[model samples]
Target chain A: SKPQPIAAANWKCNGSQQSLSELIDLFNSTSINHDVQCVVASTFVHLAMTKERLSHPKFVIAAQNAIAKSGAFTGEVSLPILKDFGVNWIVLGHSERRAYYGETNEIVADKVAAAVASGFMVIACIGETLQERESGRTAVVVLTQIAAIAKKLKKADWAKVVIAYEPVWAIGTGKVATPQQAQEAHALIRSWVSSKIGADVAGELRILYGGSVNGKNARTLYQQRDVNGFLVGGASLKPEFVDIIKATQ
Target chain B: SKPQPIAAANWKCNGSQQSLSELIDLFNSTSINHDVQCVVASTFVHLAMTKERLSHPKFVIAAQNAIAKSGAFTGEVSLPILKDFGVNWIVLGHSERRAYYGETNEIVADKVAAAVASGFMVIACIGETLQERESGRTAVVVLTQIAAIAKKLKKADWAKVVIAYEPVWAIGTGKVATPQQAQEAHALIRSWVSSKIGADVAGELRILYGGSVNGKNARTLYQQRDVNGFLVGGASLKPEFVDIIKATQ
Candidate 1:
């Protein structure tokens, strides 16, 4: 059976109330095929409002990140806190978080386990840096990142998790992977998951392609056999996100 | 003239809609002397709604944290993103972030600089651990933390910053600092600021006492010469927060 893919738009550190209102209007007015599910990651500041205004049935909301536990860590957002704002999906361990904010694979894994255990869906992101990819370590790098999360999960918990394969070099850099690059990395990922975690988990898991993903690239990226969906960045902030969603559908 | 002190509640990873609604009602219904200003640092999830509902004349809303830049950094909130939710106060450099999130002195300094330059009021937290305090290195430990932010600031930026002095040993633990302990630390902090950053800046600066600051203890702590007010933690979430505010007033 083919996996029902997701088109996740990560509105990373951008968007205003007026801007999101316009985007919400566009998302609400446009019609799309429902075969591919839709999710948008809104910043915590705009989350409660976005959750209130953007009420698309086929679309769900996800948080950009959350901490593993629910206590006294000042200046950090936690899972229990995210829940009250009506968000049930969380994106963990994006490349930027790893690079800038010191979120290691182990920290990301702890977050995934906690989110799943607390009954939230997760888009657990894994990717390789330009240096790693240039040095021909993409496969091993993503696999190690995945392996860290896999080590923390129960076999069944994979049901609520999505793997977003974003190449750090391509993300927001206007450098997209070739169709072959996206397909090859995704296939390698699924194959590893199949052998290590089990064929059942690999078959059902959705592998999303993220990084410089706009509508033009979405169609080609979506066509990859192992590229089940997308984790769009800037395109997600505009009407172009609908085009990306349509391609996935 | 005495400093126009601040009674800030760092609601560190705590509160819900129902609880905050109740807290809001209590705040709205009660009357207090306006000598001490009030601020509440809410989690991101609760911030938007907290902003909408918390309209007391003397109260202002603050975010627990935000990153230095506005960009592709996924999972972390930025200053611009926070502004949309009607929050102008940012709490940076909390002990938890430094200890748990790998925020070194440099990182905290960068954040404080960014927030002040961007026209936000800042609660810059600095403290020494139990071991450092026991070793009689409290003054040096805190002065170093303060020095980190001082290097990142223009002298004018001091107008927008409030320093919260929380001893790691007393924070969230049942161990409340004696009035003498709180006084000694705050005076040392002010004395350093007087000679180093100018006496005018030190005289005008509001140094808030955090860590196990409850209603009963607020009176003693507020009476200390350099202890302007508080950065209430657990008490901030309850009715007793009003009592602490009254003590400062």
Candidate 2:
């Protein structure tokens, strides 16, 4: 069975009422292939507004991140609250959070476990830095991060998580990985999943290529056999996002 | 003139649609004293829903926390976004944020300056830990925290910032500082303001005592000379929150 292609927009701390309205208008008017799924991982603050305004059935919403608990972590949103706002998916372990806020693999694992336990889907992000890539340790770094998450999960929980391969060096830098670079990373991740879980789960798992993904490169990147889809950054804000969505067709 | 007492509630990682609706219903139906200004610092996710559902002119909204910038910090809410949502107040540097998230005094100072610069009122939190308190370094710890914030503010910025003295030990421990303990800390902070800024500014500044503040103890705490009001934690969720709001009356 082929995995469903996902075009997830990580809005990443941008949006006002007007900007969101514009984006939603563009999204509502745009059409995409029936086989592909679109999910906007919006700032938590806008979830309610997004749910209220975004009426398309095929298009879904996700929280950019969530804490691993139900209570007492100040300034943090919980899974239950996200559910209340009609958000079913949450993106975890984005590179920015891992780098700036010290979200290690263990912390991301905790969040993934908590979300899956509550029946929520997760876009579990994993990646390596420029230095790590240059050092030829990308596989080592990416595997270690994924291993931390895998160790915390029940075998069944694998179905609820999507692995996003976002190279930190490429994110927001306009220096996207070539099609081959992305395919190699995605293939590596899928192979690891195959070895760890089972070949069936690996085949079923969606591996998205993130970092500097935009309209022009969407087709080339999405053309890769293992590259299931994208977790878009800056382009997620523009009309080009519609083009990227259509690229899946 | 005495500063208007503030009964600001830091809802802190709590509230869903049902609970917030109930709390807001209770707040809308209950009347608070005119002299004591009221504010509820809510989770970022609920601010829009809270603003839409909550109609009391006297009862305004606040964000439990905010990042200092306007872009690309995933999982963060910016000050501009708060303004767009009509959130005029923010609670910065709460002990929960400081201790749990590594929000050091320097980080907090940066946030305070940003919020104040943007014309948002801030409940700036500072405090001593149990170790510092037991070691008789409470004043030193407290003053040092205040000094960092004071350095970032223009003299006029002081007018928009309310200092919340939350002893990290007392927070969530149910072991609140006794009235005298709280008053001593409050007076020391106020005097530091007097010495650093001026007598006039010090007299006008509001110092809110946080950590385990509840309806039963609200009045006694509000009675202290330097304890201008409270930054309530747990009690802010219940019907009794109104009682705490009227404590100054």
Candidate 3:
């Protein structure tokens, strides 16, 4: 039997508790293709509520973000504590954190190692700004972040690494990357892993395209080589989310 | 006898959970001196744990930070929600949020209003950067921020407001303000309140000195007429925190 592919949707900082309940209801109400995996990501404050309300086998949950560990960091939440509440996965190092929150490649790398060490499935995020890509420094800037973290992990830990390659300009901008652009980045990340780490681990790793890749372009973009899946952003609020999940089928 | 002055140590984003227990143990072991207030502001995740573990009147605990209201917003804690867990006071509008996190003074004003509305005492922070001060904008910036919130606040709320005027230049720079300089800023803020709000309210307010105010320098600084107390930072981690309180007294 082949491994079931995972599709994760991050609604970010924009939803009420009632809205999260409604989302979970919508997810449970609809029939899901079991061959594909589905996980809904929401704010940490909503996790306990989302966990309480949602009860579908085909569906799971992820935290939009979490702290490096459970500690006294004023504004940060921890994974071990998250685990106590049944939150099993965390998204680390999004483009927004890098741009807005002063997250460096090194800081995110520390976050990745700490999250991995805590035994949570990690969605390791990497991306380039429009300026970086336009100046042709996309590969160096993006891959540097991933390779730096990959250096910290053992081969078996690769099983937990889900790469989300989101383009900085396209995220929340409604500017969808063409299938070719998404594919090229995904393939480059994969090739980098194959050469730097081991080909076996790289071959098995899932590289998810993120950005404005939503319901409409999800199908065409998913068809590209190495574009294993997507980390849905805005379209996550729509019922078309299930449609995107089914498109891969 | 004169009422003993009070102060708190908010080791924001600086300690770990296990370290919190250690700090509490050290605090509890030492014979607490009177003529001062000693409280610890712990991180949100550890609030309930710290509260339960260290139950005593002298060991009053505050949430490191919290949103004015609970519910919604990922990765952030709310004040009203924290109240359920027994939080009674909050530190608002720190320079870190203003400088790095893009928190506008208007938003901090809104938060101060909300925190007051929710029945929590606020240690409202106001400070000008070194550049702004040198440019003669210190008094203007400080007064404007206070005035922004003071306009919306009720008279009863003034009793609960403890102004923390941390000049940004002196924060983390090992630079202590001369007693004269500290007095000028605190006196200026008090005078602004006296004219704009009410003389009685201004006289009643506790203008706490901040920014590198250690035990060694606290006596000279606290001797100034307008200086009532302190919101100690790095020195909060030291045994000298007790000395700073005594120095103020």
Candidate 4:
């Protein structure tokens, strides 16, 4: 089998200290498949406490977003600072940025390139809305977004990148994509990678399914050919996230 | 005299790990007047580490921005999780948000109300750009913004609100507002507060003059009737911040 699969929980803007502690306790006490790389991407304020409280090596911390510059972007967080805080991963290019924050494809591309340059293992996300998918523009949108960063990527940088596809409609709305729908998107991305970067590299790449992934559906999602793992949201805070991790085996 | 004044440094997406540690070490080493409430608002990634490294009891921490929700908004910190990191204050409604992010008065008002409701003391900022000031809409802008939340605030809540006047022209660019100009804007805010809330509340408010406040100008800035103290920016990283703190007393 491929090396241990990975799963990242983007908590978005959720959780109190108490809930974070509870989540940590839940994660620490539970034993999952050692073959899964499980991480919790928390709000910036709680990264340190979450890291300290969740003291297991297997459970990693990720900053939901971080700044490009060392000390200039007003409200932005820096990757170097995240590294110092022991944060090994960062989630970039979520559908939320495109929907709510107006982060364009070019900007997301720049952010991914920058985060990778800063030595962050990036979970770069790309997904279209139901409207776009229905219009058959998912591949076009995904290819367009990926191509912008592909032009900027180095060969070694491939190891640092994990693509997360989070459909806009399914995110945070208590809805989920059926495993087939998720696999279709992942397969399209895989084909794009094979065509653009080469089949060998594409096969080695990790493509994750997001948008309301939980324990109930993770096993089904992971069983799909190209669905390497998951990028979870609502279910991340639940103890069931461990079940999703264990299901990868 | 205004009861024990509070001052803040809007580090504003600035500082590296070493610089953060140094600032915290300096803050810990420096003694403060029991009369001055000192705070430092930082970017998200550094919050937990800053809280851990900072040794001063009188010193409190603040986040530059937070989401209104528990776990849906990505790349934004939230009040509940910030409180977990022991972040006691927040700086909302900075001019940059209005200029760059298209934040309106309504969003700022909502943020302020939410922050206070979540048990955070808010350093609510109000000011005008050069053009807005030239057009004489400064008071209009400030009043229109606060009027929305004034109804939600109690007399005790007003005490938790520190009003900061930051002329947009003075932020980051070389331009610094004159002490006299700052005093005039702050006086206008005080007058508005007295009319909006009551004289008792206005008299007791700490009207902080921010926007590029540094060590050299802090002495003159502190002398203004309404300019009780400062939200030190560029100078906050230096040992000179200690001098600026001492200059007021």
Candidate 5:
């Protein structure tokens, strides 16, 4: 069975109160196909407002990140609080967080385990750095990232975790992976899941391609057999994101 | 002349939608004295709602932390976006952020510099760990932390920056600084400011004492000449917080 397609937008560190209204209007008015699940992962500042205004089931709210536990981690939004704001998804372990903010594989695992245990859908991110890719260690790096989360998952937890593969080199640089590059990585990720969690679960898993994924390339990227959908950045902030969401339709 | 006292509460990782409304009602109806500036530094998830619901001139909204820059820092709320949400104060460099989250003095300095530059009032926190205090390096550690921000400030920037001295051992632990211990640390901090910038600026700088500050101890702590105000921790969430707010009066 083909996985349900997910077009998730990571607004990242952008959007203000005024711009948020514009984005909300754009999302609420745009008609997305029923086959695709649309999500906008927002900054903590906007989550409440996003929940208040954009309550449609078709468009769900996601927190870009959350603390592993529900308390006392200063400067962190926790999963329970996120749930209070009606957020259903949490994006964990982005390459940006991995490289700049000291998010180790162990830390990412704890976060994923916590989110899954608490019954939230998670878009857990994994990718090889440019250096790792150049060294032909992309598979090894990506597997290591997945294996950490795999150790923490109960069998049922598998259903809630979506893998987003973003090559560190391709993110925000306007450089994107060729279709072969993306498929190979996506396939490698699925095969690992199949080996560990059984083929049925692997087949059902949605592996999203991130890293400069935009409207123009979204269709071609979605055409790959293993490429379930996209975790769109940059383009997520623009109206053309609708184009990315409609890529499959 | 002494600086106006500020009784600022850091809700930390606590507060729910129901409790937030209750806190707002308490804040709106409570009669705080005119001399003290009362601000509630909130989690990013609650900042917008707190600002919208609590519009009394006596009370203001603050973000618990913000990234130094405005973009691309995942999981970080920026000062500019905070301003757009009508947040005027930011709590930066708490010991928890410094210790658990790897906020270095250099990082804290950049955050303070950025917040001040963006015209936001900064409640910058500095504290000595239990180990540093046990070894009697309290003054050395505290002075070093303040000097980092002092190097980045224009003399006039002093007006917008409030120093919060929360001895790490006392935060959230029932243990609080003895009035003598707190007064000594507060006085030393003011002296360091006096030497670095000038006596007038030091006298004007509002150095707040935090760490298990509650209604019961608020008056004794405020009676000290150097302890201009409090950056409260756990007690901020309780009705007693109102008592602490009125302790100065």
Candidate 6:
């Protein structure tokens, strides 16, 4: 059987207390399936409120980002800080972080290893740029990102690590990869994990597709053997996100 | 006469609910004189708690840092988000942010300009590293940082902007600028503001000293003419912080 499905919402830099309180109310009233696990990664400010209000076993709270090491890093949150506020998952290396803030492959890998070491689950994001895909270097670019993480992680780290393949072009762009294209990338990634790391990891790894993933396309996207679930963006803010989570079920 | 003295504490990736609750109680029980304003920038997770517990007019809440622009910037908090939670101040360009997170001068300028335009107060940090000080490029380096903010902000924005001069070597290193040393840098900064901008603007600007400022030394440090106040670091986490705040009195 396929691994249990996962869906995570990254609010990014959006939302206020009033707006997010409505989100908590909406999600509380919605029904989610037993087989799927849903996660919400709000901006750090909302973590406490989200945890206190959005109380459900099916749901988990995540920080959109956190620091690799703790002390003296201003403007960044640490794993223990998240834990104290009731957050156990962190979304590291979103393409936005890479493109806007200059989070290089090595840096993203560093974050993943550190978060996992600190007992927080990490949604480690890796993807090819539109130009990289067009130029026929998609595999090279993505594998390099993956290889960076491979270098830092112990074999056991893979269990708590969820790989998210979000194409830089598709994220927040309202453009999504076709299922065939997504499957092509996911299969390539799994094959790489199989040969390079180990077959067991390749079988058990849950690779999520991110980038304009919405309710309409989610089911077909989730049907792809290697497209395990999704790391949603703008759609995460809408009621349709509930539908996306249901699609996984 | 010196400007109304200001003190901003940067919790800098530290504190938890239990620990910070006691801080609120301690400060609430202590008396801060009428002449000075105190600011606290807790890690984002603790802001809502700090605001609720540390409710006093003498104290202002600040985010250790915030995003330059809102929307689609994952893992970052925007200026509006801070406002919704009653945070009116932001500490930008701290030495740790500069040396660790690859926050460029241009980026820090962008944030100051954005926050000021959005009607939030900014504690803009500038400083010289140990090597820069030893080599005599302290003025060059710190002015270059100031110039970046100058390039982005309007003269009127200076009203909401507080310049904090924290020498990098002194920050978190148990080292501090001698009162004379701090005055030199603060005076250099004020002089730059006076000449390049306008004397009236420079005269009104509040330039605070930061780095290893503690209770024992704060009274003498505050006596520096150019040093309007302080952006305290580690001591901000201690009860001694109360003494530092009262030191300005």
Candidate 2 chain B has its poorest 10 consecutive residues by lDDT at B167-176
lDDT of 1 at A182: 94
Q: Model 1, residue B180: what's the lDDT?
A: 91
Q: Write candidate 5's Cα lDDT for A1-249 as tens digits.
A: 477899998888888878888988988988765688889888899887888888556888889888865566667778888778777798999888988888999999999999998889999999998778879898889999999989988877899999999978766555657988899999999999999999889989999988676778888888889988888878888989988988855
TM-score chain B for all models.
0.96, 0.96, 0.92, 0.93, 0.97, 0.96
lDDT: worst 10-residue window of model 5 chain B: B68-77
For every model shown, what is its TM-score relative to the native structure?
0.96, 0.98, 0.68, 0.92, 0.97, 0.95
User: What is residue A178's positional error in candidate 2, in angstroms?
Assistant: 0.9
All candidates: DockQ: 0.77, 0.78, 0.20, 0.63, 0.76, 0.81
Which candidate tops TM-score? 2
Among all windows of ten consecutive residues in candidate 4 chain B, which has the lowest summed lDDT? Answer: B168-177
Best by DockQ: 6
Residue-wise lDDT of candidate 5 within B66-134, one digit each (tens)? 896667776777877888887788899988889888899999999999999999999999999899999
**Model 2 steric clash pairs:** none
Ten contiguous residues with the weakest lDDT in model 5 chain A: A168-177
Q: Which lDDT tens digits does candidate 2 get at residues A180-208? A: 99999999998999999899889999999
Sort by DockQ, best first: 6, 2, 1, 5, 4, 3
lDDT of 2 at B47: 87
Clash-forming residue pairs, model 4? A13-B70, A13-B71, A14-B70, A14-B71, A67-A77
> Across residues B71-158, which tens digit of lDDT does each residue of candidate 6 receive?
9999888888887887789999988888877788998999899999889988999998888888989989999999999998888888
> Which segments of model 2 are wrong by more than 4 Å?
B172-176
Clashes of 2: 0
Interface RMSD of 6: 1.1
- What class would a CAPRI assessor give candidate 2's docking? medium
lDDT of 1 by residue, B162-199 (tens): 99998887765666678998888899889988899898
